[PDB]
Amino acid sequence: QAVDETLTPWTWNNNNFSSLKITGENPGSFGLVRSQNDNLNISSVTKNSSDDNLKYLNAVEKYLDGQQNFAIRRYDNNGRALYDINLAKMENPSTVQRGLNGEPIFDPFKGFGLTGNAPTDWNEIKGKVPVEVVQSPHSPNLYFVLLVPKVALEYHNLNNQVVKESLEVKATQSSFNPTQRLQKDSPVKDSSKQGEKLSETTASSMSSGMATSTRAKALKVEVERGSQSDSLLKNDFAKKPLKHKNSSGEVKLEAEKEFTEAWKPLLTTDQIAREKGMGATVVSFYDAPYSENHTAFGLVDHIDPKKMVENYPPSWKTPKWNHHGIWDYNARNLLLQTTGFFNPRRHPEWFDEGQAKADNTSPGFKVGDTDHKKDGFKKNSSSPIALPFEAYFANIGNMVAIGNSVFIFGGNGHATKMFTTNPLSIGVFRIKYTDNFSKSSVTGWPYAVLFGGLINPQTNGLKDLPLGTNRWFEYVPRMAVSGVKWVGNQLVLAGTLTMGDTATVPRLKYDQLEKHLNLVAQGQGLLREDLQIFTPYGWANRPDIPVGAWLQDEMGSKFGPHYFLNNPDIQDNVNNDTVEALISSYKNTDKLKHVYPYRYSGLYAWQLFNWSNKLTNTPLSANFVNENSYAPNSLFAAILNEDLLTGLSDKIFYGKENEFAENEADRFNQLLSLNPNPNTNWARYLNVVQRFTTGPNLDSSTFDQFLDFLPWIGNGKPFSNSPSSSTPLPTFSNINVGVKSMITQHLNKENTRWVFIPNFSPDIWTGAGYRVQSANQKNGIPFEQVKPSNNSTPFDPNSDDNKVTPSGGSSKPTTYPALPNSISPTSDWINALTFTNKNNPQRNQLLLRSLLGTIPVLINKSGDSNDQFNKDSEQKWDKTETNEGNLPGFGEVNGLYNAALLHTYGFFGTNTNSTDPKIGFKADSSSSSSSTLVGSGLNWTSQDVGNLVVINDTSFGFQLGGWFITFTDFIRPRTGYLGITLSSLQDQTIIWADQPWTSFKGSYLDSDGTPKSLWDPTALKSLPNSSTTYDTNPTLSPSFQLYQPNKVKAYQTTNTYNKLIEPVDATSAATNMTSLLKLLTTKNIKAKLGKGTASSQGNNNGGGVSQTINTITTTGNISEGLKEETSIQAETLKKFFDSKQNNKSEIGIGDSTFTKMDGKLTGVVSTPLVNLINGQGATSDSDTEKISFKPGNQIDFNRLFTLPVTELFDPNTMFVYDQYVPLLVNLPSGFDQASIRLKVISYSVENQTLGVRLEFKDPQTQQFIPVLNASSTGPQTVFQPFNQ
Amino acid sequence: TFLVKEDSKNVTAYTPFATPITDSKSDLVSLAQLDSSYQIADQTIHNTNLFVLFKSRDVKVKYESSGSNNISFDSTSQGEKPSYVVEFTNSTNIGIKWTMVKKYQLDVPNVSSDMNQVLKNLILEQPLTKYTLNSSLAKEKGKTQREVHLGSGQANQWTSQRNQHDLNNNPSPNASTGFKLTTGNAYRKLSESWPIYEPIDGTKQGKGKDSSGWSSTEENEAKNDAPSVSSGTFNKYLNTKQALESIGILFDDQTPRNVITQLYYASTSKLAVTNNHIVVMGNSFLPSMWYWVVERSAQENASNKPTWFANTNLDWGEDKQKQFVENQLGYKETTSTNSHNFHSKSFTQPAYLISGIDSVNDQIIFSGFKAGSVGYDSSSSSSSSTKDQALAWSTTTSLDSKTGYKDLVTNDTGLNGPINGSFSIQDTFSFVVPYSGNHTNNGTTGPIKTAYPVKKDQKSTVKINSLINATPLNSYGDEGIGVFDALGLNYNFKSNQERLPSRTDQIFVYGIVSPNELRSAKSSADSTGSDTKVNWSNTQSRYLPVPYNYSEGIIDADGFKRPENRGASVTTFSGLKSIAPDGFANSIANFSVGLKAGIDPNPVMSGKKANYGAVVLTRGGVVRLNFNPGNDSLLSTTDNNIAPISFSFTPFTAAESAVDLTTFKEVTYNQESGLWSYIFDSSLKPSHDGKQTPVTDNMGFSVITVSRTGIELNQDQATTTLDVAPSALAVQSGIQSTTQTLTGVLPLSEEFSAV
């Protein structure tokens, strides 16, 4: 029962909890503690070949019950421990006895009444470790605590052949080649099935029009239900004239021939529900620090996985399928990509069978039969979304209490995250209490049905992020959660969030998979990366064209209007007269649809905008959702609607309004919104968010200008490049990059004076890799960029396919006379939303991954012998019109500039190391060339998010890897303020570690008014083995990826970027590039940058504390960089930043302050007066030493108790009258008698006994405190007339 | 003490225990000595006095082109049953029994000479129906600008010939001039009668304004295709008799009564009260040109006459917006012999689909959609180029207009005439004209001119007259621009994207009217002979299109348009497909109902009057009207760029959109709570479908909770001046049922309510 000093306070990685600050009637701390003993040999528990995970996990839990102890001790408001609470070892525990009104029976000096018997489920609960604690908002002395199996901590220490990665490194004995895991051969036309292709429209309706055209007519798509039971009469979306390659048998997604040692969860969602020892548990309990019966239990609830999985939407029973079905399914399977919306090929963490169901077959629907009319009907399902062990504990942690209920928002995932596997919080649980806390109920729901009410008006940051959904919840939001807290009157949630997939939205032309390996690998689950990768030349004209149209021009000699190569230079002018001929004739019905003769193409932002799940003005407004992100790729914070969260039902009911279409004829007229069938309640849940935020209160190109301002944590230098003509150029923004171009000759020459800029002269910086005839012709470019299919001569303007006859026969050409000056992935075009490559999703993805410091770079050359790339006489920043400026323009990370990113990282030149590492990229013109991506050398990842801490009534922030981030203005916005402030870590011994977040020991608000964070350079861990006996060219680690070869033709020596750089077969390329394939392992990047060993020097240990920069009402004011009156907002913000590169602290950007401490850092314990590191540094209550209760021999009882005790206090508030305070409490001379009084806590008039607690004005805070030293029994005492 | 409408004639006070009071059921229609044919329309409580609006189904109004008493009740067949507003006071020893106090009879307007000239040739589109189709709405494209101006067979001469036509620099010769009236929805004169059949397709079916043509054979053919209870094929027409009856059109056996009678009986719809005035306006379903203003001191036996909305010079926010609205009414210098129209006789917008009427703090607040009214030709012969054609055009702001709301709305684009059509921008299309003012493909060439689509050589031989639409859609042209305008799809390509306000289509009218200008309105109503105008200063108008999410194919709204959006299946009204779940059969025509002003109960700064904001329902979202109680005027901010603060549109979700708007029964405001409530009575649904199938879901009720949100005015020293419009928030409250017949909701208390 009493305190044991052998248990030491600690922080759990999954929630970063260490202690709860108790407040109200008796303040103090609860905090987690564990046994300090080393030599924990978990590998002594044998795993055989003939047994399953469950009896192994029970043997590990039983073994760890011998090797380790855990508890939640209470401390006073000065940091001093009271009682132990080792839940596995406490003697004769009990639940609390109740009155007939359900109230717990209580009297403060006696404590609670105990029933004399333990709670339910006590034999299986007692082994679990407590990991989070919270206090009731409305009920006194009432608390909740969360318990989990010991493997929810120790999972990282269990043996690697059961706790596998989602990928394997192998022996690499054939030499390493990352294409060996990739299905890569392209599909082909079926030599026996050509005749079923979509028909050309033989006659087209006049509609009383007059214009005419010679171009090939629209394709029909006919679909109708017919009279047969399980066949339509027509179903033209189901047509399938293509088939796969037969390279040593058929190429298709087929798990049983590919995953020979398939990854699967530790336990299934059904096992965790039935095996009561393996589920998480929340219990209510009661505590009183100075009673005889000081602690006892309330109620026990299991956080049952079936109460989450039976609350998933109907579409989550068929995650292999989506509401477009058959045509999308076939286009995906032909391109060798995932089908559905949340399939286990990308997201196995939520599936009971993991990689064993990572295939396109058996989608819950009839598909693949010999007749196109037979496909597209509902059937039985065998691979639904679940909640298996790894995802389950990431869905646990981050508690809050509201009314007669308590919630669980889930963790950051560091209960169960591995290097290649991403368990995350997918929803929220609730426990609700009934009959005055005599009874309970437990439930939970996924974030998809909660966040679906999000809209563009609900954020002061960027618009159009991929956070939208529809009547089918195929957008699946999940978070690494920082926490949930009260920010003054408003309840707030924070963390990092998954968007929809921004990267794989563009889709390949059917034959070209052999030359675009990264885009297919990123679609295959092989490249688990969410950053957008530039690949434009191999994309089809349109992602959504039905596959029966793809064969309409195999030669390319007609530039087949319905299906062709994506390039924007060669597409229609459809003017005042033209639309009535080429497209407005094809009217259609309840059983007919069409594909139109319009030529269509665009760059990455066109593809992304067209088929990503962007937010709009309306909610439920995303009828296309390409896929879901592998890991969190956004910051997040939001205001959560606490009374609506209190008022939502436990059970969620869906119906036929959330089912996918049962047949394709009902899919043909598919309503995007429909009435809930009024017994159902699913649509109520959408309104739990009032407001949200994602980054700075900035808009358009201004957000890219902010991206350049922050320092890179690998070296402390800004991405801006302006603090030092042959000088280098920035990576994210476009200001001062290339040349000032007059846009007055852009468009079809159509209208470009006062249109796009706040000033008389329309000057725009054209960016890197731009196209011009000459420096004298820097304004626009004329049409000359024609592309053949073979050597087959020009695109042929003024030909009959490029003409129409209008009313009165006055024919004219349907093509552009002039074009935009740039296509490069760095492009910013205010005037051209289809040639711009920057986008609002990418602006937020770049913000997060440049904070985490792990944006990759594109390479041709390593630092090795004869391989080297140079700073001098090999790069020309002033000549970005030609190959000597070394812009890749293919395989590059979107929105940014690679050579500038390489320079800011210091991969070439003396920027980051004492000698030139000579790693980089060069655009050669003499021969074909090969390329691949590599990491920055840093190891942080987007799940590395720590405690949400609330600073005051409107300001809050959190730790995020090497940063602390603050959302200072989100609750009460202002004009001219950026709304975010940031502090960087400084310690290179943390920043260059191989799993760096394991050194963070928790974050807290401190008594001097600053948030602070704990760090320990001794807490880092190596990789699972030392590579044993061989060089592991692939080394699985938290910043590794299987980046594929991209191969390309020679760059032109002049006019280099006037056309896109042409790709070639990459399937054999890996043998030509071995020096780059070795640099895929991030340890070799550290070795070549000089960071890989003790060569970093500095502190040998030096653990301790970190603190955010000082702040005032002026901090983050940028009102002179906002607005416009003489130029464009990003350009004046660039002028405003360039005088301030030496003085970033007034912008709210800079390095943290830091202080060292000796020994281990394990965790804080916190209370309203003080914070104690490791629980050391406790105090004598030095402000209150002179204050004490009078002892029983100093009281003359009949002087007090001649009057009944009924009138010694005010009945409306229970404080004792002022004159009787010095009659019961000793106080020093000259003391302020108004600063202290006594509160009655229990009494009985028939015994004349009065029980009291004292309250005093804290010198530090505008609030009352107890005086802890006031007696040998603490702040509580009793007085009675000699009758005790 | 909760007075609840027991039926169409009985109102009874319910105790807070949700129990009727003994001997409290009262027959108000008989209590007011009005025959049983009367019924109660709307009731309000003001100083614990219950007022009632009585509208009878026996009323019959006749219109005569000749004479003075042009609009008068048809007393020949005992049809002189004008509508009454009756003040009822509880006058006893504290037991609920109402009594006559005053009884004001609302009389038909007196038509001046100018209004007479306008109404003689005026024609009203048949009312919007619950079961109405996009295709139904759709009207075949009219003569293009070049066809109207230069004539036929004048191609490639635009450039040359445009100068003398005061159309200089005009970049769209193929710009629609309107919609042909030869087909579509039935356009009938006031003295005529609407049909019960709505054409499925308004490009092919229906005979439009040709009443003689419709009645000759097309009426019989439509009757054959669409019978009245099925046996009908329903391939060209829909028999919407049941829906016409439901939304309040009077019927003689089967044929509806005359249009003047229908308009009057619709105008007797709602009731807002003041300590000195009582105002009555029309319902939301079909327009209402005239609204009665009642002087509470007027004699019991005296006559109360309304004011023509045409005589109410509303302030649309900008003189430029007002002239936009004015210029589409019709040609100005008609001078044929009598071919006068609304614009020619100098009258403003004549028809509003009044969403609702309410009062607070002695101030009256009104809101509603601007009902489209435009000129049309009635030459009947050679013949006019524009013969049998509506003269309307979309007025969307151009792509290069200066960023900012003010600039947007003030943009000269379509000042006088048509300029929009089809255009190409980079890798996408913009139906909006890319240029305005003096902007072109080679520089600056001079101002862009626009003119009314009427040939000048025929200035004396073109007979132009006005019409009134049944919906906000001013221009019915089966065209892309039209659809875009309807759906709110028009966007600029600049750095900061903006929705292009269609200054003359889907316009949303709202404001607060003060007692002085109400007295001015009453004086206008009293005016005899010369017609006198009414000035409403504290009013505003906002382009409020239907959400694009209600139309199949349109996924999002942005400057970049997906190429498939150019297809005829989304370019035209007729090709458009509706996925509207709010009980409407259409997804083009917006519709508003249920304005209820309320006092903000939250504390306010001392010396500052308490906030009162009004909430109005629309298609796919709520609208909050923000007012400055310090001046009792619309909330406004100094920075022009900012959208008028007075306006705030918050979209709905699946639960709110599912709530039929055709079933709005009553709206109650909880004064101490500060939360609205929108009672929807499913029972209001028509008996039979538009295809004569029985309605299977006529049972149930639902409510929507409208709660204030955002940052309010005069909250604290720091919130004395505002920049962000307070925004409402609608949530499906949780009071829903399908098996029950609603009788009334009781705002029992803060924490409780009864059903």
Numbering used by the authors:
A (entry chain B): 59 to 782, 789 to 1348
B (entry chain A): 27 to 255, 261 to 412, 416 to 789
Task: Give the authors' words.
In contrast to previous studies, this analysis by classification of the native nap particle displayed both the ‘open’ and the ‘closed’ state of the tight interface, resolved at 17 Å and 18 Å, respectively. (c) Top view of the surface representation of the closed conformation of the P140 (blue)-P110 (yellow) heterodimer. (d) Enlarged view of the binding pocket illustrates hydrogen bonds formed between the P110 and P140. In this state, binding of 6′-SL is not possible. In the ‘closed’ conformation, there is no density seen at the loose interface, whereas in the ‘open’ conformation, P110 and P140 come into proximity at the loose interface, thus indicating an interaction between loop 662–666 of P110 and loop 1173–1179 of P140. In fact, classes showing an opening and closing of the tight interface are always associated with a repositioning of the P110 stalk. Intracellular signaling, likely at the intracellular region of P140, then triggers a conformational change within the P140 stalks, changing the angle of the heterodimers relative to each other and thus transitioning to the expanded conformation where P140 and P110 do not interact at the loose interface. This allows P110 to reposition the stalk and close the tight interface, resulting in the "closed" conformation where no sialylated oligosaccharides can be bound. Despite classification efforts, the intracellular region does not display differences between the ‘open’ and ‘closed’ state.
